[PDB]
């Protein structure tokens, strides 16, 4: 009776589609005749953070907007001062294959994970001044692609074994495990309120989950290929995704449907990192064409190009202050742009 | 502002100590040579890494071993702790010197999957610059499978009917011209992929490896040597 179930699912998804078409009374770009284009944006590399031997695969900013963690594939987790270009820390990792790094909102801890298939947490504010790993989270069975601290005790971890998880660091066990995805969830983003989070997977679907109740609130499927990069809009209502389709997509949770498609004919490489500026008017997108782009998120136009890297842009972040944007890349340097 | 100046001086001291440690680590990093080992359940890549290993126990996802030949460090990653999809974690290995590719050469039905994996690795936009040291494994078992009959390699590969042996080594594969005609047919099947693309950026280095072979460390050595040589000769563009 699997065919009856398939047609039942097709009926309910056509109900979802008709609800989305009822939402789609007018497209966003039609309403925005009266908005002023941003026009011209150029951003210059204020600091070239050079200290990494291998390709930089992740970065995370600080909440102080100055102390950023970065992760490269030689085995170094380097915490940099973005202001004075000083390497305040450089941890040797146990396994060099890390694909994500996290910086705690308090700034007390950092985290890492990847092909070691373990989320390690390192205590920055140690008593002795020598940073040590606090605990390892060893419950995932794929790889690790994104981790974010909710606080100094709760951490949510995306993975290659199709499941996100949320962990108690002091306990060491998964407080919950989000097991709705079909394949290889690659990036997760936290809402401002940290009550619900979004995550895109290689099943071309970006899904909204509730933190406390451990279930998938909503599912979005507009992309055609693997999703590599997700971030909420700064208010928490919308979120944009960067997929291997070579297009970015802006979905809104309250409408359950995509709003914008940021793409162009002359871009045929997958977005590897995405980010929203503090206003959300700028959507910043790493790329495999060796250069970042910056988009106006409200008209789907290229506001500007951030071309400074010899290799693909593997990571991309913006400060909570909104002054800087750091782009790491596979050419082993970060660059900070205003 | 005086304690502010002390804070900046302590920051500069931290940066100097960190960068000295990073030079100390960069030397070892460039001294070692990374090798992504790839294979399948059929392919005896665990046996191959065992000959470079033997001649503590941990389940931390992926095997990651060390061997050394003529004072050169070789650091070889068996990624055996992930799912059977590999199109995202293979991007982490765009900077490895040589991808090892171990293939069970006896099982002809698995070989189309092996060549499909090889063709994916060859044409991947991040692995298009990494040379592959193909290790066609289990030649002593392929000899049994071809000399025993009752396994129709022509029915597994129809191109084998119209194939002739180009070249051979005399003592070790040259006992029988049938199994030899088998084994190079497998080899050329991968080489037809390797020469189909890649403008001098990467090369296949196929080796006929038995179940036991103590020389695979030296084969990886002498092929990584040619790989480094060929890229040094490729910044010159004498082509």
């Amino acid at each position: 009776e699997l065919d009856q179930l398939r047609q039942e699912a097709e009926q309910l998804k056509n109900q979802i589609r008709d609800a989305r078409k009822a939402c789609a009374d007018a497209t966003l770009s039609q309403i925005t005749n009266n908005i002023d284009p941003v026009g011209r944006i150029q951003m210059r590399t204020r600091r070239t953070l050079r200290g990494h031997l291998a390709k930089i695969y992740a970065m995370h900013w600080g909440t102080d907007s100055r102390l950023l963690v970065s992760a490269s594939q030689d085995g170094k987790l380097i915490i940099w001062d973005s202001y004075t270009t000083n390497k305040v820390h450089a941890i040797p990792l146990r396994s060099s294959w890390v694909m994500t790094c996290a910086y705690a909102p308090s700034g007390n801890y950092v985290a890492c994970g990847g092909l070691d298939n373990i989320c390690s947490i390192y205590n920055l504010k140690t008593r002795e001044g020598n940073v040590r790993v606090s605990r390892e989270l060893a419950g995932h069975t794929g790889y690790l692609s994104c981790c974010r601290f909710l606080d100094d005790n709760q951490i949510v971890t995306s993975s290659g074994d199709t499941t996100c998880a949320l962990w108690d660091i002091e306990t060491g066990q998964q407080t919950t495990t989000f097991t709705g995805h079909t394949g290889d969830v690659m990036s997760l983003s936290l809402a401002p309120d940290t009550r619900l989070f979004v995550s895109g997977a290689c099943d071309a679907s970006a899904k909204l989950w509730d933190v406390r109740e451990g279930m998938c609130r909503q599912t979005f499927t507009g992309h055609e290929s693997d999703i590599n990069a997700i971030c909420f809009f700064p208010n928490g209502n919308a979120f944009a995704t960067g997929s291997d389709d070579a297009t970015c997509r802006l979905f809104d949770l309250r409408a359950d449907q995509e709003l914008m498609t940021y793409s162009h004919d002359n871009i045929i490489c997958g977005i590897t990192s995405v980010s929203f500026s503090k206003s959300g008017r700028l959507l910043l997108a790493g790329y495999d064409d060796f250069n970042c782009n910056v988009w106006d998120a409200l008209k789907a136009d290229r506001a500007g190009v951030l071309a400074g890297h010899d290799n693909r842009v593997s990571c991309l972040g913006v400060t909570d202050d909104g002054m800087a944007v750091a782009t790491g890349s596979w050419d082993s340097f970060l660059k900070i742009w205003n | 502002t005086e304690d502010q100046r002390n804070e900046e001086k302590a920051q500069r001291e931290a940066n100097k100590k960190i960068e000295k440690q990073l030079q100390k680590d960069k030397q070892v990093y460039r001294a070692t040579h990374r090798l992504l080992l790839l294979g399948a359940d059929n392919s005896g890549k665990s046996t191959i890494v065992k000959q470079m290993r033997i001649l503590s126990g941990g389940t931390s996802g992926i095997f990651e071993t060390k061997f050394q030949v003529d004072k050169v460090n070789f650091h070889m990653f068996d990624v055996g702790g992930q799912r059977d999809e590999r199109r995202k974690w293979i991007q982490c290995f765009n900077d490895v010197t040589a991808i090892i590719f171990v293939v069970d050469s006896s099982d002809y039905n698995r070989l189309q999957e092996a060549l499909n994996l090889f063709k994916s690795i060859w044409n991947n936009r991040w692995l298009r610059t990494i040379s592959v040291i193909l290790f066609l494994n289990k030649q002593d078992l392929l000899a049994e499978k071809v000399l025993a009959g009752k396994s129709k390699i022509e029915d597994y590969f129809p191109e084998f009917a119209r194939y002739t042996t180009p070249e051979d080594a005399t003592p070790e594969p040259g006992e029988d011209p049938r199994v030899t005609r088998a084994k190079y047919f497998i080899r050329d099947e991968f080489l037809r992929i390797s020469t189909a693309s890649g403008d001098g950026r990467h090369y296949c280095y196929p080796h006929f490896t038995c179940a036991v072979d103590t020389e695979n460390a030296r084969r990886i050595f002498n092929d990584c040597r040619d790989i480094i040589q060929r890229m040094h000769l490729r910044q010159y563009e004498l082509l």
Partner: nanobody
Amino acid sequence: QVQLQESGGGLVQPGGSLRLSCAASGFTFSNYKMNWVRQAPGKGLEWVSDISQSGASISYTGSVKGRFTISRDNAKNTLYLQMNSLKPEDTAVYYCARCPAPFTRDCFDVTSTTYAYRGQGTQVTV
């Protein structure tokens, strides 16, 4: 959403003829390399054929090289497997698998797990 539905099949005596058609919606069909993958009962999955973006580059596995023929039309978003001179070794579920990315010649589509852009399925029995 992305869908890949297969039409055709049923039961055919050995030596017959058949033609599977995949209607694939949810993407630009031309920009991707399409594949036909089978699953014989009591086995895993194993790739059968593939066709490039424009249809120029074509390949089949070492069993169905002369018999079957892959084809595609991109203005109809359809991928055909013309099956001729069928065999009892050809009884399998047939999925039109898609390569995971556009504009690339690398594909990872045989996976024993639930690959995302594989089709739903079709019993073809001989």
